[PDB]
Amino acid sequence: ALRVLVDMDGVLADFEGGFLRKFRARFPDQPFIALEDRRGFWVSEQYGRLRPGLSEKAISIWESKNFFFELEPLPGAVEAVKEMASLQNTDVFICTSPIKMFKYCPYEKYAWVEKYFGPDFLEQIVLTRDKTVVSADLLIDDRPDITGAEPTPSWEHVLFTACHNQHLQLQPPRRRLHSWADDWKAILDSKRP
């Protein structure tokens, strides 16, 4: 069976839009970064450059109760993953790294998966900071630099497009999934025997 790992934040759940909305509501007198002007993976770093103390204020949004639970799905994400999981000879796992503050985030990610995919899909969740030690054919993740304890992961990393990575030139033969409307079936098929 083909095995596909799907990232959660920025791939299934709209982390960037949820963050921005809550930041602006909580900190209406601070400057912010429009989604179109996001550059680089780390939200907090971009905000820290924008003004002193803004990194810590950004962090405070995602460390808050209900931040993860209340993220809206990306367009097409829930439908695509449900279809993907239902395909013959195809195992799908949601492989997600929780933030360092653990009071809410792990719990909310399970709750979010239950909400959008149902109880039986909880079995498909892998929470890990290191995705390199999870073996699979494909990893669909918006982070450009995925590293860890395994220097040669078994998966091919397909870069899921986001605001923060859309201008990046990747090294051949690295590939992208532009959105869930893009042809994810063709990418899966290219790895099948």
Ligand X SMILES: Cc1cn([C@H]2C[C@H]3O[C@](c4ccc(C(=O)O)cc4)(P(=O)(O)O)OC[C@H]3O2)c(=O)[nH]c1=O
Binding site for ligand X (CB under 6 A): 9-10, 15, 41-44, 62, 96-97, 99-100, 129, 143
Q: How far is CA 85 from the centre of its chain?
A: 18
List the binding residues: 7, 9, 15, 41-43, 62, 96, 131, 142
User: Tokens representing 139?
Assistant: 């990893």
Applying CB under 5 A, the site for K ion has a residue count of 5
Comparison of 87 and 125: residue with beta carbon closer to ligand X: 125
Q: Whole-angstrom distance between the N-terminal and C-terminal Cα of the chain?
A: 10
Catalytic status, residue 37:
no
Cα–Cα distance measured from residue 25 to residue 20, given in angstroms and rounded to the nearest whole number:
8
Per the CB < 8 A criterion, the answer to whether 105 and 129 are in contact is no
Comparison of 10 and 153: residue with beta carbon closer to K ion: 10
Question: Residue 106 binds which one of ligand X, K ion, a copy of itself, none, with CB within 5 to 8 A depending on kind?
Answer: a copy of itself
Per the CB < 8 A criterion, the answer to whether 81 and 117 are in contact is yes
- CA-based max dimension of the chain: 55
Which of 9, 14, 137, 141 does the annotation list as catalytic? 9
Comparison of 93 and 184: residue with beta carbon closer to a copy of itself: 93
Q: Which residues of this chain interact with K ion, rule CB under 5 A? A: 7, 9-10, 90, 142
Q: Among all residues, which ones are annotated catalytic?
A: 7, 9
